[PDB]
Amino acid sequence: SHTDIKVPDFSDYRRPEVLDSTKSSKESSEARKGFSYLVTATTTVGVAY
Amino acid sequence: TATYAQALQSVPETQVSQLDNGLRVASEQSSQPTCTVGVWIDAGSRYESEKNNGAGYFVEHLAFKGTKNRPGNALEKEVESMGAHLNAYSTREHTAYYIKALSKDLPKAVELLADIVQNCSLEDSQIEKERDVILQELQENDTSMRDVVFNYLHATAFQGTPLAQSVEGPSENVRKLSRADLTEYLSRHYKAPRMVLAAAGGLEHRQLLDLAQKHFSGLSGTYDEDAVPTLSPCRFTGSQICHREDGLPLAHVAIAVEGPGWAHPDNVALQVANAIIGHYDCTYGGGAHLSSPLASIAATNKLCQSFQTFNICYADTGLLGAHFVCDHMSIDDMMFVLQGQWMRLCTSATESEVLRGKNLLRNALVSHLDGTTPVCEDIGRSLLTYGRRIPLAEWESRIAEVDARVVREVCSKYFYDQCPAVAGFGPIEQLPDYNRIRSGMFWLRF
Amino acid sequence: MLSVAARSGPFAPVLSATSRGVAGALRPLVQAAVPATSESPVLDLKRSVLCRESLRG
Amino acid sequence: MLTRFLGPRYRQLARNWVPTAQLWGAVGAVGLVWATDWRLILDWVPYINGKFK
Amino acid sequence: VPPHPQDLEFTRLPNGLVIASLENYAPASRIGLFIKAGSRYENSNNLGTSHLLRLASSLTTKGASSFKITRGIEAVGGKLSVTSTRENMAYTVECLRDDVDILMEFLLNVTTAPEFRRWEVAALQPQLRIDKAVALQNPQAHVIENLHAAAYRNALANSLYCPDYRIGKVTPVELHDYVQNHFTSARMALIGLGVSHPVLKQVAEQFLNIRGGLGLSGAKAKYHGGEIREQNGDSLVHAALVAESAAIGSAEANAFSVLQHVLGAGPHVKRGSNATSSLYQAVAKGVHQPFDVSAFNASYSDSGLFGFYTISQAASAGDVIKAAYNQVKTIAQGNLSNPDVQAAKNKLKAGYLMSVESSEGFLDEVGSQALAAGSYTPPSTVLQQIDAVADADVINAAKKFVSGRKSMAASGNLGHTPFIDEL
């Protein structure tokens, strides 16, 4: 009965590199963090400026 | 003085064979008067669809309630009367049926397994009787916080995949699953090349091979054209599932990162790391002096009632982390410390702790394979996973290869700056926010 | 056939350093999990079962 | 009495943090240099010759 | 094809100590020191002393501190446990082959050189409460404990767990006293697996020659009878009904063991109907749904308890106990077939063989055999001894139960649980 749970569908919030089951996500792990971290780096670089 | 090393070579080789069926027949002879035999099949909830999920679990119920040649309670009386024990279990990737029995009863033990595995009656009245038993086990299971929390952990970690599902299935499948759904799941899966007949004890390989040929020949006298028995990989998702229930006296929490899978050699180092961290329970003698910093800090500061590390392996994926139980005002401290230890190992592991972790694995490995049943289960499922047996000595060499570096690198790979899967049940208001948990997976000084 | 504990029945408590506090002699229960509704806590003011110091790779 | 921190484990600990401590100095040097416009140090970087001669 | 399977070697020293070893040629080593020091040796002034002791195996010793015992043992992956029974304590240690020495030395220190420092034992007291609460989470443990308290006037009546009033009260001197009056040479057995005889033998002669305690069975359990009832609104009623039966090692004990498998004692098939369990099947007849039943069998040095245990919904405890008791009356009255005794013989036999399959069940079997009987008795002769039980012996055992004064314990909503006189 706690087995009637099921996590709801997040398809419309997901980054495209994921979104597909069959595919592992480790493969887009570096890119997705890459992009989000680059954003902060750039920010702090700008704020540094 | 036989040395430990020497004794590892003294362990007799596991003998493997194959019928024309594709059925692998494997044994480890030992000269005990007793033995364990059974069949290992790779079938389990991960192979099921939304629609028939809980099918295998339903068969396991029916499995011992009557074949064609021994209907109703005839099985029971044959087993009970020889003094043997008949068990079964199902995980998400594996199913098993085995008999513990007097060694000279191997012939019937085997005769019995074939009958179970092949001629399962599935009498319509029985399935109905079982419908209510399973439902009942479900209510039963809902009260084990730990079982519920790992089920949640799988459900969020593998969120849109088959590995997300539990073994028993949802209540509605139990309600609607019909006989035809079962027979189709059986035909689809209980096929020779995915079954291993395993045994351990005072037997001899030829006898087991003969019996395998006598009672098992005739399973893949067919073998399918385009069927579709392939397993698709399962997406792991960095996510959190929080089942808040302030009516429960303690919180259950289970965190994990994505493991590599049964085949990956990285598993040896991961387990060594996991041994270092250990487990803990409030009935352990000596707390402040325990080697594991998590364990000792938890004991001194009462952060915990229990906790354990884990490495669940599935094909090409897995869950690697820890689960813990604690009071409502200690979840935050338990997480802080648990996470400090992963980080510490990732970047800072020392040599003597790795040695302790290594030895702990050696003792565990050997302590475990003690007696026919555990060895049988190991032969049976190893062939399912690795394809071979992997003798103690090979494990020993793998373990020996691990040193601090290996721990640091191997830990970094799976743990460092990685999105975890979080499952929580109970008085969990103080469970840290996901961003906060996520930030604990990397160190700003590193 | 001595070993009162395992001669099944009498009670035998175990304490550990590394493993876990056990109470495991004999009484019925197993066939109470069968005809069912044998709840159990999971992990109420407690400890933990199956315990550890066993594994593989 | 600082001999409490003298042993094999401490030496392995010291080692594992050398690269980190090294790289932190890298960050500190470049950062001090660039915030004061270290005439001396900078005049040697190919571009960043915004001081002509 | 495994190598030459060695024979166990056994030795009694003039001081009474017994050493038994088997070279397993196995990757790991297991070693135990079994002592006649269980609960039955406490008396009314020192109840619980042996529980606290069970819990103090890592306190400091002359020769090894608490910190060292813990780190030294865990640095090699080993373990140290203490298993208590009403008759005995068993200190067991395991580790790989190459580390037996340090584990041996830790073992010797804990069992022959504990210091019981006043502050370490004070810090330990609250573990008695946690340890007891965990065990008593199973209704079975309270029932079996009340069971023995009702069945006996002393000795075996003591519980495995410390009485609450004594928590915080057991003293360092009581622990020093219990060790020295009970951990002596003639009350001990040193069992080893994966170690050589001369090595164990040397250890015994070197480090286990102590005597200055008690020697007897310094009590002799006086079976008495009676009932203890704990009302508690658990959901099911747990109940156990018992009579005095046979002392371990008597041929009659073997009749009880077989009577136990005729009646039934544990399931053989996952989720099975338990067709060959005469007890179950007899309650199943007139009772519909949640319930368990099984024969209960406990034999000790100078006594024994045999009967049955029932779990049922509160309203049908009476039906369940009465149907079960009737089933035993039916076999006392002579209604027993040879094929049933024969089948019960096969579960006992198979079960015993199964229980010594692993090194830990073997170690315990050899250790308990060493204390109880002063010898090692191999599987073929145990089997042979079970074989000599006659149908008539099993009937006699059943008869002894039916006509003997009884003891009962029960917990739950008792509104419908019969007292003894109502049986």
Short mmCIF file of C-alpha atoms in Angstrom, two decimals, chain E:
data_model
loop_
_atom_site.label_atom_id
_atom_site.label_comp_id
_atom_site.label_asym_id
_atom_site.label_seq_id
_atom_site.Cartn_x
_atom_site.Cartn_y
_atom_site.Cartn_z
CA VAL E 1 36.86 -32.64 -3.78
CA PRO E 2 37.65 -31.32 -0.23
CA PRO E 3 40.83 -32.38 1.64
CA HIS E 4 41.27 -34.74 4.64
CA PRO E 5 38.45 -33.76 7.09
CA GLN E 6 40.17 -33.71 10.48
CA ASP E 7 38.71 -35.22 13.63
CA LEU E 8 37.79 -33.02 16.54
CA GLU E 9 40.27 -33.46 19.43
CA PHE E 10 39.10 -33.34 23.07
CA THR E 11 40.92 -33.02 26.39
CA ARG E 12 39.99 -32.92 30.09
CA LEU E 13 42.68 -31.54 32.38
CA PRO E 14 42.98 -32.70 36.01
CA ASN E 15 41.50 -29.31 37.12
CA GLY E 16 38.26 -30.08 35.29
CA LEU E 17 38.83 -27.73 32.40
CA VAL E 18 37.94 -29.16 29.00
CA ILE E 19 39.59 -28.19 25.70
CA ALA E 20 38.05 -29.13 22.33
CA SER E 21 39.45 -28.14 18.93
CA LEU E 22 38.80 -28.86 15.25
CA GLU E 23 41.27 -27.88 12.55
CA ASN E 24 38.89 -26.69 9.86
CA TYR E 25 41.56 -25.60 7.38
CA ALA E 26 39.12 -22.72 7.00
CA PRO E 27 39.93 -19.09 6.14
CA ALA E 28 38.70 -17.86 9.54
CA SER E 29 39.02 -18.88 13.14
CA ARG E 30 36.48 -19.08 15.76
CA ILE E 31 37.17 -19.50 19.46
CA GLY E 32 34.88 -19.73 22.46
CA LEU E 33 35.26 -19.97 26.25
CA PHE E 34 32.09 -21.53 27.67
CA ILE E 35 31.38 -21.09 31.38
CA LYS E 36 28.79 -22.43 33.80
CA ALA E 37 27.86 -18.96 34.84
CA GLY E 38 24.41 -18.14 33.52
CA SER E 39 21.52 -16.65 35.31
CA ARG E 40 20.59 -19.62 37.38
CA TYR E 41 23.76 -18.88 39.55
CA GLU E 42 22.51 -15.56 40.70
CA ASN E 43 20.59 -15.48 43.92
CA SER E 44 18.15 -13.02 45.45
CA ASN E 45 20.78 -10.55 46.62
CA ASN E 46 22.48 -10.15 43.30
CA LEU E 47 19.89 -10.43 40.56
CA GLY E 48 20.95 -9.03 37.19
CA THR E 49 24.70 -9.30 38.00
CA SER E 50 25.16 -11.65 35.11
CA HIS E 51 23.27 -9.41 32.72
CA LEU E 52 25.56 -6.43 33.43
CA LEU E 53 28.53 -8.89 33.03
CA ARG E 54 27.24 -9.99 29.65
CA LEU E 55 27.28 -6.31 28.73
CA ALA E 56 30.84 -5.58 30.06
CA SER E 57 33.00 -7.55 27.76
CA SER E 58 34.85 -4.48 26.53
CA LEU E 59 35.43 -2.65 29.88
CA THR E 60 39.12 -2.34 30.78
CA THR E 61 41.26 -5.32 31.73
CA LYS E 62 44.66 -5.66 33.32
CA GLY E 63 46.58 -6.03 30.16
CA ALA E 64 44.12 -4.31 27.81
CA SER E 65 42.04 -1.12 28.10
CA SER E 66 38.57 -0.62 26.81
CA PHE E 67 39.80 1.52 23.90
CA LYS E 68 42.33 -1.21 22.96
CA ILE E 69 39.94 -4.10 23.09
CA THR E 70 37.63 -2.22 20.73
CA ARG E 71 40.25 -0.87 18.32
CA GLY E 72 42.52 -3.89 18.44
CA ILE E 73 39.67 -6.23 17.62
CA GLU E 74 38.20 -3.99 15.01
CA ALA E 75 41.57 -3.23 13.34
CA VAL E 76 41.63 -6.89 12.23
CA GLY E 77 37.97 -7.17 11.27
CA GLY E 78 37.24 -9.51 14.18
CA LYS E 79 34.44 -9.77 16.68
CA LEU E 80 33.75 -10.45 20.36
CA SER E 81 30.35 -11.68 21.63
CA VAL E 82 28.78 -12.92 24.84
CA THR E 83 25.86 -15.31 24.78
CA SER E 84 23.95 -16.11 27.91
CA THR E 85 21.60 -18.94 28.77
CA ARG E 86 20.11 -19.70 32.25
CA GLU E 87 23.00 -22.14 32.65
CA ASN E 88 25.78 -20.58 30.88
CA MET E 89 27.84 -17.74 29.39
CA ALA E 90 29.82 -18.14 26.20
CA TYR E 91 32.53 -15.72 25.19
CA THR E 92 33.12 -16.08 21.52
CA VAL E 93 35.75 -14.46 19.34
CA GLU E 94 36.29 -14.62 15.55
CA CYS E 95 38.89 -13.40 13.14
CA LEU E 96 40.99 -14.59 10.23
CA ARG E 97 43.58 -17.37 10.81
CA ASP E 98 46.56 -15.04 11.21
CA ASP E 99 45.06 -13.04 14.05
CA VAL E 100 44.00 -15.63 16.57
CA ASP E 101 46.75 -14.60 19.00
CA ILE E 102 45.64 -11.07 19.61
CA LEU E 103 42.05 -12.22 19.75
CA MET E 104 43.01 -14.95 22.15
CA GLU E 105 44.76 -12.44 24.37
CA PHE E 106 41.77 -10.10 24.32
CA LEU E 107 39.52 -13.05 25.20
CA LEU E 108 41.76 -14.03 28.19
CA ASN E 109 41.88 -10.53 29.48
CA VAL E 110 38.06 -10.05 29.45
CA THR E 111 37.33 -13.41 31.14
CA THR E 112 40.24 -13.66 33.66
CA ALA E 113 41.45 -10.08 34.24
CA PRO E 114 38.49 -7.65 34.08
CA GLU E 115 39.06 -4.63 36.31
CA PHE E 116 35.32 -3.47 36.65
CA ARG E 117 36.53 0.11 37.34
CA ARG E 118 33.81 1.88 39.34
CA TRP E 119 33.25 4.64 36.68
CA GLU E 120 33.23 2.35 33.68
CA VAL E 121 30.60 0.12 35.34
CA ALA E 122 28.57 3.17 36.34
CA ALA E 123 28.53 4.45 32.71
CA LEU E 124 27.37 0.97 31.63
CA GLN E 125 24.35 0.66 33.91
CA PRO E 126 21.90 2.46 31.61
CA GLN E 127 22.73 -0.11 28.90
CA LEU E 128 20.87 -2.65 31.00
CA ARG E 129 17.66 -0.70 30.39
CA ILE E 130 18.19 -0.30 26.60
CA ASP E 131 19.29 -3.95 26.23
CA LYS E 132 16.32 -5.17 28.14
CA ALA E 133 13.82 -2.86 26.29
CA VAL E 134 15.06 -4.12 22.89
CA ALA E 135 14.64 -7.84 23.86
CA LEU E 136 11.28 -7.33 25.48
CA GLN E 137 9.98 -5.90 22.22
CA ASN E 138 9.09 -9.48 21.44
CA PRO E 139 6.21 -10.74 23.61
CA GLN E 140 7.87 -14.13 23.50
CA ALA E 141 10.69 -13.01 25.75
CA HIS E 142 8.40 -11.75 28.50
CA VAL E 143 6.30 -14.87 28.31
CA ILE E 144 9.25 -17.28 28.48
CA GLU E 145 10.69 -15.20 31.36
CA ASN E 146 7.46 -15.18 33.35
CA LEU E 147 7.23 -18.85 32.43
CA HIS E 148 10.34 -19.81 34.21
CA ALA E 149 9.63 -17.55 37.14
CA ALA E 150 6.37 -19.44 37.71
CA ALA E 151 7.78 -22.84 37.04
CA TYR E 152 10.56 -22.58 39.65
CA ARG E 153 11.21 -21.56 43.23
CA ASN E 154 14.78 -20.44 42.46
CA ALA E 155 17.86 -20.78 40.13
CA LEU E 156 16.11 -21.44 36.75
CA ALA E 157 13.43 -18.96 37.84
CA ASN E 158 15.83 -16.07 37.45
CA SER E 159 15.51 -13.99 34.36
CA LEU E 160 18.13 -13.42 31.59
CA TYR E 161 17.62 -9.74 31.98
CA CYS E 162 18.16 -7.57 34.97
CA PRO E 163 15.07 -6.74 37.14
CA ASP E 164 14.33 -3.03 36.86
CA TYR E 165 14.75 -2.43 40.56
CA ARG E 166 18.35 -3.61 40.18
CA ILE E 167 19.26 -1.39 37.23
CA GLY E 168 21.81 1.13 38.48
CA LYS E 169 22.28 -1.10 41.56
CA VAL E 170 24.64 -3.85 40.50
CA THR E 171 28.10 -3.20 41.96
CA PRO E 172 31.70 -3.59 40.92
CA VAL E 173 32.21 -5.93 43.87
CA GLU E 174 29.26 -8.19 42.71
CA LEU E 175 30.89 -8.43 39.25
CA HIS E 176 34.31 -9.24 40.77
CA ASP E 177 32.51 -11.79 42.96
CA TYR E 178 30.58 -13.39 40.16
CA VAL E 179 33.64 -13.85 38.04
CA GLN E 180 35.71 -15.28 40.72
CA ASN E 181 33.13 -17.55 42.13
CA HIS E 182 32.01 -18.82 38.71
CA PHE E 183 34.74 -18.31 36.03
CA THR E 184 36.89 -21.08 37.37
CA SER E 185 38.70 -23.92 35.80
CA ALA E 186 36.20 -26.68 36.55
CA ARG E 187 33.30 -24.73 35.17
CA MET E 188 34.92 -23.90 31.86
CA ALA E 189 35.45 -25.26 28.39
CA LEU E 190 37.77 -23.74 25.78
CA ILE E 191 36.60 -24.54 22.29
CA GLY E 192 38.45 -23.64 19.14
CA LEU E 193 37.79 -23.89 15.40
CA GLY E 194 40.56 -23.24 12.98
CA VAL E 195 43.15 -23.49 15.78
CA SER E 196 45.48 -26.34 16.80
CA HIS E 197 45.03 -28.46 19.91
CA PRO E 198 48.49 -27.88 21.31
CA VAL E 199 47.92 -24.15 20.85
CA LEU E 200 44.55 -24.22 22.75
CA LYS E 201 45.97 -26.71 25.20
CA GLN E 202 48.97 -24.45 25.91
CA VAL E 203 46.70 -21.49 26.35
CA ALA E 204 44.55 -23.41 28.92
CA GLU E 205 47.42 -24.66 31.03
CA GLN E 206 49.01 -21.23 30.84
CA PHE E 207 46.10 -18.90 31.38
CA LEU E 208 42.99 -20.85 32.51
CA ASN E 209 44.16 -22.48 35.71
CA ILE E 210 42.04 -20.80 38.24
CA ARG E 211 39.95 -22.21 40.86
CA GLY E 212 38.52 -20.91 44.10
CA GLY E 213 34.81 -20.61 43.31
CA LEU E 214 31.80 -22.88 43.79
CA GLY E 215 31.63 -26.38 42.28
CA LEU E 216 28.16 -27.94 42.61
CA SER E 217 24.95 -27.24 40.65
CA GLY E 218 24.68 -25.01 43.74
CA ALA E 219 20.98 -24.92 43.79
CA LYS E 220 19.24 -27.77 42.07
CA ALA E 221 16.27 -26.18 40.48
CA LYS E 222 13.16 -26.95 42.56
CA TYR E 223 10.30 -27.25 40.05
CA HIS E 224 7.23 -25.79 41.67
CA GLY E 225 4.48 -24.76 39.23
CA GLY E 226 2.00 -21.97 38.97
CA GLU E 227 1.04 -19.20 36.61
CA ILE E 228 1.94 -15.59 35.85
CA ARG E 229 -0.46 -13.39 33.94
CA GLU E 230 0.43 -10.10 32.29
CA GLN E 231 -2.58 -8.07 31.01
CA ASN E 232 -1.50 -5.53 28.39
CA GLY E 233 -3.73 -5.13 25.41
CA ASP E 234 -1.07 -6.39 22.89
CA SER E 235 -3.32 -7.45 19.95
CA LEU E 236 -2.82 -11.20 20.26
CA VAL E 237 -2.63 -13.31 23.33
CA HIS E 238 0.64 -15.10 23.76
CA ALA E 239 0.46 -18.13 26.04
CA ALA E 240 2.73 -21.00 27.13
CA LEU E 241 1.65 -24.12 29.09
CA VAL E 242 4.30 -26.38 30.50
CA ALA E 243 5.15 -29.31 32.84
CA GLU E 244 8.39 -30.63 34.27
CA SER E 245 10.05 -32.92 31.73
CA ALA E 246 13.63 -34.35 31.36
CA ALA E 247 17.20 -33.14 32.23
CA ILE E 248 19.54 -32.74 29.20
CA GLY E 249 21.41 -35.92 28.53
CA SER E 250 18.88 -38.38 29.96
CA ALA E 251 17.44 -40.80 27.43
CA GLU E 252 14.04 -39.44 28.36
CA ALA E 253 15.14 -36.00 27.13
CA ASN E 254 15.42 -37.59 23.74
CA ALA E 255 11.76 -38.81 24.02
CA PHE E 256 10.73 -35.23 24.69
CA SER E 257 12.61 -33.99 21.67
CA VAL E 258 10.75 -36.44 19.45
CA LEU E 259 7.44 -35.68 21.12
CA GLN E 260 8.20 -32.12 20.20
CA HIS E 261 8.44 -32.97 16.51
CA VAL E 262 5.37 -35.13 16.54
CA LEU E 263 3.37 -32.21 17.86
CA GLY E 264 5.25 -29.62 15.80
CA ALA E 265 7.98 -27.03 16.35
CA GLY E 266 8.66 -24.62 13.56
CA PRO E 267 7.61 -24.39 9.93
CA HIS E 268 9.29 -26.21 7.07
CA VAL E 269 7.71 -24.51 4.07
CA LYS E 270 7.38 -20.77 3.37
CA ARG E 271 3.71 -19.96 3.91
CA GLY E 272 2.72 -23.58 4.24
CA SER E 273 -0.32 -25.18 5.88
CA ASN E 274 1.85 -27.28 8.22
CA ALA E 275 0.13 -30.50 7.30
CA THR E 276 2.31 -32.79 9.33
CA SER E 277 2.12 -30.64 12.48
CA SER E 278 -0.45 -32.37 14.58
CA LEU E 279 -0.82 -29.44 16.93
CA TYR E 280 -1.37 -26.82 14.33
CA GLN E 281 -3.74 -28.91 12.41
CA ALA E 282 -5.69 -29.67 15.56
CA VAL E 283 -6.17 -25.99 16.44
CA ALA E 284 -6.93 -25.24 12.76
CA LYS E 285 -9.89 -27.59 12.98
CA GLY E 286 -12.05 -25.51 15.34
CA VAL E 287 -10.28 -22.17 15.03
CA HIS E 288 -10.55 -19.78 12.17
CA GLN E 289 -7.73 -17.50 11.56
CA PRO E 290 -4.82 -15.55 13.14
CA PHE E 291 -2.99 -18.12 15.29
CA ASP E 292 0.28 -19.91 15.88
CA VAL E 293 1.09 -23.00 17.94
CA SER E 294 4.11 -24.95 18.64
CA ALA E 295 5.57 -27.45 21.03
CA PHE E 296 8.08 -25.85 23.41
CA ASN E 297 10.99 -27.83 24.78
CA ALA E 298 13.64 -26.69 27.18
CA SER E 299 15.94 -29.03 28.89
CA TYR E 300 18.54 -28.07 31.45
CA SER E 301 21.20 -29.57 33.70
CA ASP E 302 18.81 -30.77 36.45
CA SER E 303 15.34 -30.15 35.00
CA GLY E 304 13.37 -29.49 31.92
CA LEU E 305 10.15 -27.75 30.77
CA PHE E 306 7.96 -29.17 27.92
CA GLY E 307 4.57 -28.11 26.56
CA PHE E 308 3.27 -25.68 24.00
CA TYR E 309 3.10 -22.03 23.02
CA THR E 310 0.04 -20.36 21.41
CA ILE E 311 -0.48 -16.99 19.79
CA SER E 312 -4.12 -16.10 19.05
CA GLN E 313 -6.66 -13.36 19.01
CA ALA E 314 -7.73 -12.50 22.57
CA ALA E 315 -11.19 -14.01 22.34
CA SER E 316 -10.07 -17.44 21.16
CA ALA E 317 -7.11 -18.13 23.47
CA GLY E 318 -9.25 -20.48 25.41
CA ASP E 319 -10.25 -22.39 22.30
CA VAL E 320 -6.66 -22.48 21.10
CA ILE E 321 -5.11 -23.64 24.41
CA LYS E 322 -7.83 -26.22 24.96
CA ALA E 323 -7.68 -27.67 21.45
CA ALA E 324 -3.84 -27.91 21.76
CA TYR E 325 -3.85 -29.49 25.19
CA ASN E 326 -6.48 -31.97 23.87
CA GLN E 327 -4.10 -32.88 21.01
CA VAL E 328 -1.40 -33.86 23.51
CA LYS E 329 -3.93 -35.80 25.58
CA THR E 330 -4.82 -37.70 22.51
CA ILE E 331 -1.17 -38.97 22.04
CA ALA E 332 -0.77 -39.66 25.79
CA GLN E 333 -3.85 -41.80 25.49
CA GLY E 334 -1.91 -43.88 22.96
CA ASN E 335 -3.14 -42.56 19.62
CA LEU E 336 0.12 -42.26 17.81
CA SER E 337 1.21 -44.01 14.65
CA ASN E 338 4.72 -45.40 14.04
CA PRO E 339 4.98 -43.42 10.75
CA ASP E 340 4.47 -40.19 12.75
CA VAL E 341 7.16 -40.97 15.28
CA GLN E 342 9.28 -41.97 12.31
CA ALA E 343 8.65 -38.67 10.49
CA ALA E 344 9.12 -36.66 13.70
CA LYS E 345 12.43 -38.57 14.03
CA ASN E 346 13.48 -37.30 10.62
CA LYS E 347 12.88 -33.65 11.39
CA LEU E 348 14.80 -33.85 14.68
CA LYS E 349 17.62 -35.64 13.07
CA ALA E 350 17.69 -33.35 10.01
CA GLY E 351 17.32 -30.30 12.20
CA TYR E 352 20.25 -31.23 14.43
CA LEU E 353 22.44 -31.88 11.51
CA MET E 354 21.35 -28.54 10.08
CA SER E 355 22.02 -26.62 13.29
CA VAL E 356 25.75 -27.73 13.28
CA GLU E 357 26.31 -26.97 9.62
CA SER E 358 27.96 -23.62 10.23
CA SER E 359 30.92 -23.01 12.44
CA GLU E 360 28.96 -20.99 14.92
CA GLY E 361 26.31 -23.66 15.50
CA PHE E 362 29.07 -26.28 15.74
CA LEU E 363 31.08 -24.17 18.20
CA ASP E 364 28.02 -23.79 20.38
CA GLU E 365 27.09 -27.43 20.15
CA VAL E 366 30.57 -28.54 21.04
CA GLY E 367 30.79 -25.93 23.84
CA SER E 368 27.43 -26.79 25.45
CA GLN E 369 28.23 -30.47 25.13
CA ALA E 370 31.54 -29.85 26.85
CA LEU E 371 29.85 -28.16 29.88
CA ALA E 372 26.74 -30.30 30.13
CA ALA E 373 28.29 -33.76 29.50
CA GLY E 374 32.09 -33.50 29.67
CA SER E 375 32.50 -35.05 26.26
CA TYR E 376 32.01 -34.69 22.55
CA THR E 377 29.28 -36.77 21.02
CA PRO E 378 29.44 -36.99 17.23
CA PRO E 379 26.51 -36.73 14.74
CA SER E 380 26.25 -40.49 14.14
CA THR E 381 25.79 -41.32 17.81
CA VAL E 382 23.37 -38.46 18.43
CA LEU E 383 21.41 -39.86 15.51
CA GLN E 384 21.73 -43.37 16.94
CA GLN E 385 20.46 -42.05 20.32
CA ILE E 386 17.43 -40.47 18.66
CA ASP E 387 16.87 -43.73 16.85
CA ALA E 388 16.62 -45.66 20.15
CA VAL E 389 13.63 -43.65 21.17
CA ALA E 390 10.58 -45.95 20.96
CA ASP E 391 7.02 -45.01 20.19
CA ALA E 392 6.22 -45.93 23.75
CA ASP E 393 8.82 -43.50 25.12
CA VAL E 394 7.13 -40.65 23.20
CA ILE E 395 3.77 -41.71 24.61
CA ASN E 396 5.24 -41.77 28.14
CA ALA E 397 6.68 -38.26 27.73
CA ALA E 398 3.26 -37.09 26.56
CA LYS E 399 1.75 -38.86 29.59
CA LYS E 400 4.17 -37.11 31.90
CA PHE E 401 3.07 -33.77 30.54
CA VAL E 402 -0.67 -34.44 30.84
CA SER E 403 -0.48 -35.56 34.46
CA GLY E 404 2.23 -33.23 35.77
CA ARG E 405 1.71 -30.11 37.75
CA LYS E 406 1.72 -27.23 35.28
CA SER E 407 3.17 -23.75 34.82
CA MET E 408 1.65 -21.07 32.59
CA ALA E 409 2.55 -17.58 31.50
CA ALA E 410 0.40 -15.42 29.20
CA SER E 411 0.34 -11.83 28.10
CA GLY E 412 -2.31 -9.87 26.29
CA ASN E 413 -5.93 -9.16 26.86
CA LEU E 414 -6.59 -12.12 29.15
CA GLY E 415 -10.37 -11.84 29.50
CA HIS E 416 -10.68 -15.19 27.73
CA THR E 417 -7.49 -17.02 28.69
CA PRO E 418 -8.07 -19.95 31.03
CA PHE E 419 -6.26 -20.18 34.38
CA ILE E 420 -4.62 -23.59 35.04
CA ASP E 421 -7.51 -25.05 36.96
CA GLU E 422 -9.80 -24.18 34.10
CA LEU E 423 -7.84 -26.42 31.66
#
